[PDB]
Amino acid sequence: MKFTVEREHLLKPLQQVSGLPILGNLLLQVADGTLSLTGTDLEMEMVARVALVQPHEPGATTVPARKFFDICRGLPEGAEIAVQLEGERMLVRSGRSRFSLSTLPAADFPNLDDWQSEVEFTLPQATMKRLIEATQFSMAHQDVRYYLNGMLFETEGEELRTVATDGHRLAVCSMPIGQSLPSHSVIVPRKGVIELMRMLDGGDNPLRVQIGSNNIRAHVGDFIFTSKLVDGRFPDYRRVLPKNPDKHLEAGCDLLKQAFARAAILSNEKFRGVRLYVSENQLKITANNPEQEEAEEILDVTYSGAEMEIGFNVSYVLDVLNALKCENVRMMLTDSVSSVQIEDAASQSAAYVVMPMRL
Template sequence: MRLVISREALIKPLQLVAGVVERRQTLPVLSNILLVAEGDQLSLTGTDLEVELIGRVQLEEPADAGSVTVPARKLMDICKSLADDARIELELSGQKMMIKSGRSRFSLSTLPAHEFPNVEDSPETFELELPQSSLRRLIEQTGFSMAQQDVRYYLNGMLLEVKDGELRSVATDGHRLATSVSAVQTDAGSQQQIIVPRKGILELARLLQGGDESVKLVIGANHIRANVGDFTFTSKLVDGKFPDYQRVIPRNGDKELLGDRQELRQVFSRIAILSNEKYRGVRLTLNDGVLQVMANNPEQEEAEETVSVDYQGGHLEIGFNVNYLLDVLSILNSDVVRFTLLDSNSSALIQGYDEPEALYVVMPMRM
């Protein structure tokens, strides 16, 4: 196996593929990426047995065909350290991968390609295509609410639901919920619900560009595949039942607050400085036209600020984890944000004024 490639052509696919590879591995071969040269194409594959990413690069001149696995991090660090306009020669010599560029010479250990595992396929059951920007927006608007290492393993991921010509993303960690929706073209009456693991969602988001190019999603019984440009992404699905998110969304709120998103975000950020570092609680006190935000901590330090808002619902006191509020205000684009509330024990429904497709639910805190 021998090939010549420019650093510029290799670095992007290498970084994306190496991102899938975990630093600490049970199997030595999982720390490696699989290189396959054939004709004028080089393919790179990385996996952690749950998520797999294959990137393809066109070569300027045909390669001597072959396949081998090399350490992902070391190959990436070598490529990063070379000059931007460098040309890189890769040649397999016995058990070593020889890398030459200018006056630099490196020899990397290898493992045989046949030891490299691939994520096994399941029969395809469903396909859909949508713009990359739409899928990326769905992930951005909801991804921050995914749980991390929760014992309820089905929360450590994102629900993707296809129904009535819409693709909906839902994420929750049990304290808050985020959901967004985008129109897609599907067969009438087709329905699908899958849970994609957290790592799969994060890696897919890195792949997606903001443009109008489309991404094709293929859903199987226990995997999802996305074809994005020169990359093929595959992730296993989480086998579990996602909570009924429709029951979580409050429908009976009778108090509505409208406020300037950036102003509220700055107020919450300031008050958060003196909130309890562990619980991050802030108390919101609402009276007609005025919102008072307060926080204190075990050192008996206090912060308080009032802000003018559009609110005519009478007196209400309610506590929240300020981080959850800031996450929502950071992800919205609207200038005006709407809070719909019922009482101090009921969840708040938060929306951007011009973003009806995204809904956020935050549970209250006892203060």
């Protein structure tokens, strides 16, 4: 096995394939004019292809991922990196820098089980990026309900939808993708969502998604990502969206966010409850803590409904306002014993639900 490749042609591939010792190595394969690099953690896998325009010789080995990445990154910009197998070592040469790395046999590099694609679609990368970003923050972390440690991907009609919830707050985003789809849904593990997201530069290469019974695959240009799905049953987001919230408050996102952020300073550190009092075109936010410190914020907003009060966890609300990254926000209220739904005031494509607190 031998190849010589420009440093910069290896850097993006190496970042994508980087995260038993062999799981800490990358499989390198020279075949039919192409260098393929594979990383895996047994739950998921990334394969990056690099075209080889300089002389090369076929073969395959595995090499420590972090050391090989760090050597390539540490070489000077535009360096040519000559790689050859020599006995049990992998030699890396560029200028008068030489490195001998240990290897493990390509034969021992683990593969995901073979599987069949059942559902497939193509969409712009920017659309997948939007879907994931809109909701990623609401996924559970290492919860006993293992099926919340990931993101639902649901096809229906011509829409792809993502749902994330940690059992307390929920995020949902739907986008039309211009293809008739089966009604189907799957759960992608947390780490898979994150790796998928990192693969997307949002650029001009179409993203092709293939879904099997127990696997998902995403293909963009020179990169192919494969993950196991979470084998479990996800909650129905339709049941948590409030029935008929008829009290809509609209305000500038940044003004609302800064008012909540100040008030939060004097909220309970553990449960983070703040109270809202809504009246004719006015919002008052209050917060207090066990030491009886108090905050109050009054803002002009757009609101015409009945007067009401509601409490909620300000961290959950701030998470939403931070995810939204839009000029104006709509808070869709019902009463003091019901959830609130929050949206970009200009778009229904993403919706967030936060539960009421009694304070």
